């Protein structure tokens, strides 16, 4: 169970907030969710996943998860956020 997704963040403090003014990519490994801060971090995750599994890592776009349907809230309850402060 792995995925990449985007969720809101405060652009000035880097704190996760439900109504953040910016968006960040996050990486879930089935254990925790961690912020992905640089596109090359995203690329290395995508590459390793593909080498292990022969297909692309699941990605949830903001067409699927957003402030009107904040499914990341549910995911982050079962795989808690690490390395960053939330709300």
């Amino acid at each position: 169970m792995y995925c990449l997704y985007e969720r809101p963040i405060n652009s000035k403090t880097g704190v996760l907030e439900w109504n953040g003014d910016a968006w960040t990519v996050m990486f879930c490994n089935g254990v925790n969710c961690r912020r992905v801060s640089h596109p090359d971090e995203m690329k290395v995750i995508e590459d390793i996943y593909r080498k292990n599994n022969g297909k692309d890592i699941p990605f949830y776009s903001q067409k699927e998860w957003n402030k009107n349907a904040p499914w990341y809230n549910r995911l982050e309850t079962v795989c808690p956020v690490v390395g960053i402060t939330k709300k």
Copy 2:
């Protein structure tokens, strides 16, 4: 190694106990077991698992795991419960 299962919980205190008067869903990721407190948490777990693996996450119902066959006790010994008080 992922699964969802049900196990007993005290409906008033939220504490896991062997003779809980209610049941809660739990999620195991092969490292720990964690409580699933809302159906949308269960749905997001099921969706991510299916996107990764192309089939439904294993789910053990109370027909298979219950107080007369408390297999959750064995699973929670090898994948300890986190984030919730227990027995």
Copy 3:
């Protein structure tokens, strides 16, 4: 990356030691190695693994890993033991 294996244990102290006088099953999940101390703990691991993966969990018996070929030493360096004390 999951497996079950056997490795020596001191039967009088419960400590993992290279020259233990008894043997215990252990469970590795790619993150840590944890002692398995009841047959039904082994069975629940085997069942969940099979439900996820469609084949049996890898198992290393004492024919493969033993005091004359202590490969468990190498595994436990990369996936450290948890929940039990070791030499």
Copy 4:
């Protein structure tokens, strides 16, 4: 998500540094990155991965990841190093 990769290390202090004079293998399990200091640790990882997955574990050699393309920096941000001190 598992892989083996190589990255620089200080050959006298054992500390991970960007300009280490030697190289070490590391093991990533999608949660953390850990040093693989002996070839037999590499062998046991390779053997377990193959038994689970029926193919070889992804390996990033110095052909791909090196001081002029330090992709290990990106991986170690998303799966932090454990068990060793780093620059």
